[PDB]
Design a protein around this nucleic acid. Structure first.
Ligand SMILES: O=c1ccn([C@@H]2O[C@H](COP(=O)(O)OP(=O)(O)OP(=O)(O)O)[C@@H](O)[C@H]2O)c(=O)[nH]1
Ligand SMILES: [Cl-]
Ligand SMILES: [Mg+2]
Ligand SMILES: [Mg+2]
Ligand SMILES: [Mg+2]
Ligand code: NA
Length: 327
DNA sequence: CGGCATACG
DNA sequence: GCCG
């Protein structure tokens, strides 16, 4: 089992779901307390289990697996022996964890804002609604729409949305294309949002595109919230429903076609997969990877890529299709 | 021990 | 919390 998640296939569904879920609770809790290192280790240990070909049934099966030391092994040992890990259950019921989860789940609220509100004594969404002078417009939108944004987006919802984005993109710039990215591209059946990547086959034609797209969607009454030159938008869309509608988070990204493979790779995730791939690139290959390109800092050159396959080849990694990037 | 992904809004 |  290789040490980096980008070196092994990780499918969406697997054989150690309960064990990985428990480790991910500890990872999430570590993040809420500011310990990015502990978050990463628990995430990485969880992802190792997702990559295994069969269920872990005995503690000896952890021997030799990367990212399993005393603490993560103890968690698995307790789950195997008693079906529950006391540390995990203590986190689950804790007021700190439940409130930090509630607050950070809001669009526009991160760990630092959540933590400050927690220390001020706030605990519930109505606590926040009862003090709106403390909220940004973005947080106000996140809170107004919180109930709809807490409802999973379905694959049926994605198709209807891609059509309306394509319509607006077509008027804004004929020939521009719309690609579904994020978790739905990895095969998820549900999501917290819908992620799209937009480009045009003629380098440079994509400049200035996203304002033209957003104004056109806004004119059609489909935009419940957006931030407004720019190339990423984080929006809330009005999506039709039987006899009504619901609010859905939609992310739009524009990239020049020269950068499209890097932007596609970077937007397809998973989040852990991309962190691990970028860590691998820098630490093992000495190359700097981001959503725009791959930089050789010794030669001071960028690697031209025509496909995601090119990027995996230039990093010396076996190609993984999106469905196997569910780290 | 140091390191832990990345840049735009 | 774990790796090198
Ligand atoms: O912290 C982050 C968040 C996101 N991303 C990159 O942005 C993509 C979209 O980020 P999303 O937050 O939309 O996640 P997701 O689509 O993978 O899953 P859902 O929760 O939406 O169902 C991710 O897949 C990843 O590529 C990062 O690189 N880092
Ligand atoms: Cl590989
Ligand atoms: Mg998404
Ligand atoms: Mg998104
Ligand atoms: Mg230390
Ligand atoms: Na948030």
């Amino acid at each position: 089992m290789p040490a980096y998640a980008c070196q092994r296939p990780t499918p969406l569904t697997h054989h150690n779901t309960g064990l990985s879920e428990a480790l991910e609770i500890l990872a999430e809790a570590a993040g809420f307390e500011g310990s990015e290192g502990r978050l990463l280790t628990f995430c990485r240990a969880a992802s190792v289990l997702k990559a295994l070909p069969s269920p872990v049934t005995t503690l000896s099966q952890l021997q030799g697996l990367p990212h399993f030391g005393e603490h993560s092994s103890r968690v698995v040992q307790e789950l195997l022996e008693h079906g529950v890990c006391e540390e995990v259950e203590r986190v689950r019921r804790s007021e700190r964890y439940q409130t930090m989860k509630l607050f950070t789940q809001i669009f526009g609220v991160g760990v630092k804002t959540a933590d400050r509100w927690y220390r001020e004594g706030l605990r519930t969404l109505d606590d926040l609604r009862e003090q709106p002078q403390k909220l940004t417009q973005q947080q106000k939108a996140g809170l107004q729409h919180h109930q709809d944004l807490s409802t999973p987006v379905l694959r049926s919802d994605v198709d209807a949305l891609q059509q309306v984005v394509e319509e607006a993109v077509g008027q804004a710039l004929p020939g521009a294309t719309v690609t579904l990215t994020g978790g739905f591209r990895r095969g998820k059946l549900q999501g917290h949002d819908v992620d799209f990547l937009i480009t045009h086959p003629k380098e440079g034609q994509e400049a200035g595109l996203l304002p033209r797209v957003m104004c056109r969607l806004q004119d059609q009454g489909l935009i419940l919230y957006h931030q407004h030159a720019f190339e990423r938008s984080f929006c809330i869309f009005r999506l039709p429903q039987p006899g009504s509608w619901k609010a859905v988070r939609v992310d739009l990204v524009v990239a020049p076609v020269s950068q499209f493979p890097f932007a596609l790779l970077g937007a397809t995730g998973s989040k852990l997969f991309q962190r691990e791939l970028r860590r691998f690139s820098r630490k093992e290959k000495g190359l700097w990877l981001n959503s725009h390109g791959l930089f050789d800092p010794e030669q001071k050159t960028f690697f031209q890529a025509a496909s995601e396959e090119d990027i995996f080849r230039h990093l010396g990694l076996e190609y993984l299709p999106p469905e196997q990037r569910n780290a």
